[PDB]
């Protein structure tokens, strides 16, 4: 019976957005299961489908809206509804596919794609890479518009890919990372439209293996270094959780919590 969080690109503040993200994290996460200070998303196994998702209503100064579905375990996007159609990504397995059926049930046209929603897959369809794809509010306005318009087929596929690539980032990743949230914050703040820098990107690709590195750390100290990039592309290794604290907001459950 899923909980929804509205947002509108329309007039949006720095506050209104921080307001937004700070909010969906709440609806995402267990409250406290936290390792060495970082919050852990709910664990796919126990989770009843009742609690498996949350929904996000996104609206426009162009005055239209669409609803996104998010895997609570995941934080990522599984699909969306625009009006009377709903679209979902190709499920990576049996279990996952049964869950989605619980999503937009009212919808008369349920479409399911042949491809995953991994960045790799989308970048391929977008025909471009994430760093050629501008992020910001203007981008997100036009993105929502597109997804709606997609359901009507006024919009092409690579256009749709690009739109997803925008949202997954501006939401799933913003939610996963205060760093990414705060970057969008200042993007809105100075009203810039610009593609994601490397730091943002490598963050996005390493999120899975950070979640692992951390929970499995010894009292915060990483088993093995995790290579990252700074805003300028300069590579650097992460040996300890201490520095991630200010950055990463959520981790996918990996191991049973320590004693």
């Amino acid at each position, epitope marked *: 019976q899923y909980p929804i969080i509205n947002f509108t690109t329309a007039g949006a503040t720095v506050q209104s957005y921080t307001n937004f993200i700070r909010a969906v994290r709440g609806r995402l996460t267990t409250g406290a299961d936290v390792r060495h200070e970082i919050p852990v998303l709910p664990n796919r196994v126990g989770l009843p489908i009742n609690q498996r998702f949350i929904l996000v209503e996104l609206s*426009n*100064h*162009a*005055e239209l809206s669409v609803t996104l579905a998010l895997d609570v375990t995941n934080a990522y996007v599984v699909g969306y509804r625009a009006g009377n159609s709903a679209y979902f990504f190709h499920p990576d397995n049996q279990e996952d596919a049964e869950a989605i059926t619980h999503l937009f049930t009212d919808v008369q046209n349920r479409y399911t794609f042949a491809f995953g929603g991994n960045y790799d897959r989308l970048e391929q369809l*977008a*025909g*471009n890479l994430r*760093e*050629n*794809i*501008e992020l*910001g*509010n*203007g*981008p997100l*306005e*036009e*993105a929502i*518009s*597109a997804l709606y*318009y997609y359901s*009507t087929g*006024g*919009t*092409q596929l*690579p*256009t749709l890919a*690009r*739109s997803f690539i*925008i949202c997954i980032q501006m939401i799933s990743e913003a939610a996963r990372f205060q760093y990414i949230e705060g970057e969008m914050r200042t993007r809105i703040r100075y009203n810039r*439209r*610009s*593609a994601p820098d490397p730091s943002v990107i490598t963050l996005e690709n390493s999120w899975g293996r950070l979640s692992t590195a951390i929970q499995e750390s010894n009292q915060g100290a990483f088993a093995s270094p995790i290579q990252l990039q700074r805003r300028n592309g300069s590579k650097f290794s992460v040996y300890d959780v201490s520095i991630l604290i200010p950055i990463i907001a959520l981790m996918v459950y990996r191991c049973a919590p320590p004693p």
Partner: nanobody
Amino acid sequence: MQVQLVESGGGLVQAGGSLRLSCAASRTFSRSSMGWFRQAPGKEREFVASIVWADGTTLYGDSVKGRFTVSRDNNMVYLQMNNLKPEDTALYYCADNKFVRGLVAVRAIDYDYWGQGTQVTVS
């Protein structure tokens, strides 16, 4: 249903003539770029020229670089075509790229919405 772009100005000139294309965007705000592509029947869309919204940097495809000039208005956008060669004969299109970093986007794949088109011809 889409953003609904349209261009006028197509026609017949003698070889060497000049011609000028015009375009109108119809709830449309953030752009990051707009560009004109041309397609001879049976072939695929050549890039031609584009103007990065924001800055207004102009970028022209190889064959045309010197004779064609591009400009933004307000809404509205323009392509000047000067000294026409019979090889310019083709269908010309308007594109709104709402997404790609404006410098990097030169391709049919890179633009989100397409104008309807208007024809061009020559000696």
